[PDB]
Swiss-Prot record, chain A:
Catalyzes the phosphorylation of the ketose sugar fructose to fructose-1-phosphate. GO terms for biological process: fructose metabolic process; regulation of glycogen metabolic process; response to fructose; response to glucose; response to insulin; response to sucrose; response to zinc ion. Signal peptide: none annotated. GO terms for cellular component: cytoplasm; cytosol; extracellular exosome. This is Ketohexokinase. It comes from Homo sapiens. Beta-D-fructose binds at D14, G40, N41, N44, D257. Keywords: ATP-binding, Carbohydrate metabolism, Disease variant, Kinase, Nucleotide-binding, Transferase. SUPFAM superfamilies: Ribokinase-like. GO terms for molecular function: ATP binding; fructose binding; identical protein binding; ketohexokinase activity; protein homodimerization activity.
Amino acid sequence: RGSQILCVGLVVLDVISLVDKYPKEDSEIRCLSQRWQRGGNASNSCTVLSLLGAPCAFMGSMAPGHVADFLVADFRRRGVDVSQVAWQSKGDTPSSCCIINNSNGNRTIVLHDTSLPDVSATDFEKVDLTQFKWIHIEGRNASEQVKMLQRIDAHNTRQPPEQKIRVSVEVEKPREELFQLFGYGDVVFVSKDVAKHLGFQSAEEALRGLYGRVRKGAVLVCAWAEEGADALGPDGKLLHSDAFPPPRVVDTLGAGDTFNASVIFSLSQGRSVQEALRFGCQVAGKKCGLQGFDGIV
Amino acid sequence: GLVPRGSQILCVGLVVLDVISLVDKYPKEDSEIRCLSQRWQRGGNASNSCTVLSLLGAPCAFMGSMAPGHVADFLVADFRRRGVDVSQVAWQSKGDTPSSCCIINNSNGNRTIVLHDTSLPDVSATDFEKVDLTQFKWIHIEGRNASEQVKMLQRIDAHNTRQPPEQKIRVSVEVEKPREELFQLFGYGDVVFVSKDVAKHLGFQSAEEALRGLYGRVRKGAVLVCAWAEEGADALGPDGKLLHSDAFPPPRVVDTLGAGDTFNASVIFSLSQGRSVQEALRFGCQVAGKKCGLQGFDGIV
Ligand SMILES: Cc1ccccc1Nc1nc(N2CCNCC2)nc2c(NCC3CC3)ncnc12
Ligand SMILES: Cc1ccccc1Nc1nc(N2CCNCC2)nc2c(NCC3CC3)ncnc12
């Protein structure tokens, strides 16, 4: 069957305040405007995949309430298949305050991480893999997710190399539990932040450094903000793309997630890595000159 | 439902959703962090006063602007959680329901605040024209859009004219922000609360200075009231006698957000039960002092 891309990670309620300068501690400013957004990484990518025309599904934990009710209404307005959601009985829907600096698009996030339990190999074991051509996993609970990945590798072995499910991993946080995911998946996304918190000061360094850790045959991608992004495949040849900066950067909240969704969409449509990188930077760049996600397509 | 004539106390003003985050350290711009804890709270001066009026046992209503949406839903259910009648809300078709973001540093205590946008339209005098006043024994107004609020106050004067002294609606006004627009509001109301912040911005350095210095601006026969945190609160009436009450410090101070509103509501309450101004200053101070030792409004009983 396999027409859908699945993203596994967080859905968070983003309570957003657009200010024109980042307030100095102990001071007080008035925001230009405010809004609510369905956020969290896997969730954001689903938004982006949807907008690009790719049928997709989200999978993460949500706790029933008025909050979950809004997040789902939004998922459904987008056409994001939520049927894979691991509903919880104990815990709250995470949320966060996001101050977005309108003069330069900087975004500052205060996350309220609830009790809410992550999805587990248990919940995942319960999933119909034959619906998906691509599966992307937001690194969080490594122990449990590695399990999930193996269930997919093991599912690929019993498949025509034609009908194999493509797998991508994001390692966005500098915490060590996650460095095992490097690891699995055809495509591995590592953030500038991780890369720096590990000694590296350029996208090309990070890639020469970390290529050691990836499933043989994998592509490692590392974006570097206004500097574009680089990728490195089995052949050893470094690939680069210049960023596409909008003329006014006004909102970079979910720029990384836009990059990733875009890279995945492109690879999932047959494109070269070079083309998918370029496209990643192109949509990310365009989103930086917009409030939210509407208007990138 | 049916509200018995002359039974409710109405507070007009702001309701806002405050999202309050406690953090290890103040986050550097463009960073992502995890707060120690986060809380969603209904706030705003007329808003907090209602909560307290309800907890004190007074039927009370809130009048302010909201826009349909999920923030309004949370604020409305919070009002209801506190027994506040929201049937007088002025629902708006344009703008955001006010939402403030508030960041508290756990390792030095400072508060950083992103204030709600200014997009939602205040309640106008023409909205106020539409309200049947007979349900109210007292109307309290948090000064915001004074040009318009003056009209509302003039309407209440009109109404009181055709009424026996025992169906006249008492009126209180609150000037809490140092803005020229607001000062005309001194001229209206039987009771006028001026905040410590306003008094200082005008150069006064105590409750006594402020009361002595501003009483000139209130209408004949009005009482002017100035609370001053740990120094207690003063009041000055037509008879020229300055009245005072000391503060009642709690065993330990925990949460002073909304203490000014707790005081306001408590004085209003006491006056409305027929108590003397002196008895009501005291009570205002007792209640606001108890509230200072408590998280939120819960245990103020
Ligand atoms: C290419 C990419 C990958 C992953 C995340 C974001 C991006 N793109 C950009 N991120 C940021 N970031 C996110 C990281 N913090 C800084 C802003 N800034 C820009 C930018 N800024 C305008 C430059 C001043 C000319 N122009 C184009 N693309 C991006
Ligand atoms: C009486 C009153 C009217 C209006 C607003 C507040 C109050 N009461 C108090 N405010 C503050 N404020 C609120 C404003 N920031 C400073 C503390 N501190 C205290 C306090 N502290 C105990 C220490 C012995 C003095 N004890 C009793 N009442 C109040």
